[PDB]
């Protein structure tokens, strides 16, 4: 009676239904959970925002053209201004969170294309200057909601001003590894003849037990167009990719006044 | 070994200690609790901000002169901009909350004075105009953190503009009942020879099971100077009254975008 | 509606409502449509980053051609009134293109959709009165 293509996911007061889905990837075979008492790093009383922040948040819909080359989001910081998870984050020094990334892109049965949806632990990217090394600013490394785009050309700016940003090169995947090897990460491929949604379940992955979300970006969401979009009547059409992310099993420590980072 | 004058109250990550306290008043003999399932009005999933908003919040310290006539705070709206309880409030349509009001005022052993600290259910006050009835604006009825003051003179402004505010008359207690009868409320008296702190424990009191905190103000905190401050060398001294309030056992319903009320 | 005519014989009502939406487009027309319910007491939602924060449902188009957005009973009073009253206001409801609806060639672009209303099994009324349709 049941099928693998119809899936409803509910967290808090938010619901995603999908009728042409592929199967869901639990990353590295572990469902996210709270910090156990045998591994706890801080000793303060942890805040568990039970349903106020364990819910789906819908980002901005980027448009996937025929010349679109890729997108990237840093995952505990693309939700920095989303409801109460953006208010649980900056009022606390520590924070761990599991995730349910759901990437939404659909077309007709006459379109074609592929979207490698990745989820990269410690997605450290390269700077866009050759004056200095490991050299990216804070605003350019943490865009938040809008994310960033990749590029099919590496043009390092000789200015140290405009070179403090990610040299988001698509075939080297930012960090100088080939993109055809990126399938060792937890990944799904949106193929516009088979499916229309990619669902990943991401546990908290870090060397520490719990860490500052304001400093440290745990996961990296990556969407690569493997085969470009090609619609035969209108070759320059645009189908939107909408990313909907939920925090899961969040836990925070060290309450204080609000942290407001710089914007420039 | 133990005494009634030394009391530590801890909620969340906040602590009040006091070494010259009187006994604490649990209002109407009931400790505050969550909404039971046999009385629940909404059917959505309730948000329980377990430790993020059940903690002590310190308001602004008003100065109690020899000519100070009284103060008033509306209790679920004096905390409207306090941490996450001000963020749990405006992102939800429903809200119930117990309270732990702790009023802090201390002097030497040479001062004298009395402070009737009250807690009035449905503290409906009178308007300061005789053009219309039941006629108060929103900003003038809900000051928030700073509260309001009483006055020993009733001057109704003939303008309907400047008359949309509380006619805070002290001996008629705002609502036209005599102030000497206000001891039928849960009350404590700060007496500067006996104690220096007034602690009340206020359950959620409303006809409904749960109600909008943005519309409806449940309790009214009232501090009346019964006997005025009198310090014999300096007759015009000022000792500060600091009010420290904690929400207790909060529960919220109906999540949506943020409510931002008008400011003028 | 049939629900609205019975409620105009009564005064006080409680319970949740059921909005079942029938898509009457073509077969090849695929799409996703957001269906949202926002409880009252804030800005009425106009853009999609205001109605995602409420109680919503993301509906997909295909074989099963009827969704159901439920408006739950989220209310201060036990009984809302059967008038336009400010104190017993109900909620704000919108409907957004989730991604968009895509049609191929040889298929109409402008389509239509039907919208229903009923009552959940916890819906009940009180206080019979006259109505205001007929004179």
């Amino acid at each position: 009676g049941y099928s693998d293509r119809v899936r409803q996911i509910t967290l808090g007061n938010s619901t995603i239904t999908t009728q042409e889905a592929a199967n869901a990837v639990v990353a590295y075979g572990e469902w996210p959970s709270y910090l156990d008492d045998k591994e706890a790093n801080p000793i303060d009383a942890p805040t568990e925002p039970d349903v106020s922040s364990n819910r789906f948040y819908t980002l901005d819909s980027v448009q996937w053209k025929s010349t679109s080359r890729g997108w990237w989001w840093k995952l505990p910081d693309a939700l920095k201004d989303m409801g109460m998870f953006g208010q649980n984050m900056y009022y606390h020094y520590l924070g761990r969170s599991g995730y349910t990334v759901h990437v939404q892109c659909n077309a007709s049965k006459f379109h074609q294309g592929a979207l490698g949806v990745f989820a990269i632990p410690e997605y450290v990217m390269a700077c866009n200057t050759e004056a200095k090394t490991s050299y990216v600013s804070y605003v350019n490394a943490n865009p938040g909601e809008k994310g960033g785009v990749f590029d099919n050309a590496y043009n390092p700016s000789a200015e140290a001003s405009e070179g403090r940003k990610f040299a988001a090169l698509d075939y080297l995947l930012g960090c100088g590894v080939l993109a055809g090897n990126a399938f060792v990460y937890p990944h799904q491929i949106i193929n516009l003849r088979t499916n229309n949604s990619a669902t990943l379940v991401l546990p908290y992955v870090n060397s520490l037990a719990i860490d500052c979300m304001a400093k440290h970006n745990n996961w990296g969401l990556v969407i690569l167009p493997l085969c470009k979009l090609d619609y035969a009547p209108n070759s320059s059409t645009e189908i939107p990719i909408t990313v909907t992310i939920a925090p899961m099993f969040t836990e925070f420590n060290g309450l204080r006044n609000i942290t407001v980072p710089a914007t420039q | 070994g133990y005494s009634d004058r030394v009391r530590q109250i801890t909620l969340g990550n906040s602590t009040i200690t006091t070494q010259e306290a009187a006994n604490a008043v649990v209002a109407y003999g009931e400790w505050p609790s969550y909404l039971d399932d046999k009385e629940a009005n909404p059917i959505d999933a309730p948000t329980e901000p377990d430790v993020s908003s059940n903690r002590f919040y310190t308001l602004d310290s008003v100065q109690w002169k020899s000519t100070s006539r009284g103060w008033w705070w509306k209790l679920p709206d004096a905390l409207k901009d306090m941490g996450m309880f001000g963020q749990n409030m405006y992102y939800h349509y429903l809200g119930r909350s117990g309270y732990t009001v702790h009023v802090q005022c201390n002097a030497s052993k040479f001062h004298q004075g009395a402070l009737g600290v009250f807690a009035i259910p449905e503290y409906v006050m009178a308007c300061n105009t005789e053009a219309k009835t039941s006629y108060v604006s929103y900003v003038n009825a809900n000051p928030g953190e700073k509260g309001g003051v009483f006055d020993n003179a009733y001057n109704p402004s003939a303008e309907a503009s400047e008359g949309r505010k509380f006619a805070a008359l002290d001996y008629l207690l705002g609502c036209g009942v005599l102030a000497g009868n206000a001891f039928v409320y849960p009350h404590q008296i700060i007496n500067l020879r006996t104690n220096n702190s007034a602690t009340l424990v206020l359950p959620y009191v409303n006809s409904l099971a749960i109600d909008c905190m943005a519309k409806h103000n449940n309790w009214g905190l009232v501090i009346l100077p019964l006997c005025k401050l009198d310090y014999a060398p300096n007759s015009s001294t000022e000792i500060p009254i600091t009010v420290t309030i904690a929400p207790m056992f909060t529960e919220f319903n109906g999540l949506r975008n943020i409510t931002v009320p008008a400011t003028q | 509606t049939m629900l609205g005519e019975i409620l105009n014989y009564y005064t006080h009502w409680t319970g949740s409502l059921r909005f079942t939406f029938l898509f009457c487009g073509s077969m090849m027309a695929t799409g996703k449509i957001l269906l949202s319910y926002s409880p009252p007491g804030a800005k009425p939602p106009t853009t999609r980053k205001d109605a995602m924060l409420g109680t919503h449902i993301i509906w997909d188009l295909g074989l099963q051609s009827s969704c159901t957005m439920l408006a739950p009973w989220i209310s201060n009073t036990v009984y809302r009134r059967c008038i336009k009253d400010d104190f017993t206001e109900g909620g704000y409801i919108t409907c957004f293109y989730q991604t968009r609806i895509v049609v191929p060639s040889g298929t109409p672009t402008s389509m239509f959709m039907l919208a229903f209303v009923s009552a959940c099994p916890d819906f009940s009324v009180r206080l019979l009165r006259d109505t205001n349709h007929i004179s």
């Binding site: 049941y2 099928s3 693998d4 119809v6 899936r7 409803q8 996911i9 509910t10 967290l11 808090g12 619901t15 239904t17 | 399932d37 629940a40 059917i43 999933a45 | 319970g15 079942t20 029938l22 449902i57 099963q64 051609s65 009827s66 969704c67 159901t68 439920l70 229903f116 099994p121 916890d122 819906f123 009940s124």
Partner: peptide, 26 residues
Amino acid sequence: TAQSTPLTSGVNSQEVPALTAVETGA
């Protein structure tokens, strides 16, 4: 009485009650 409301939590499964078909008459 009218029906009560059970304490339920979130789901992620193939059992989908939110989708009906009013062509069937129900």
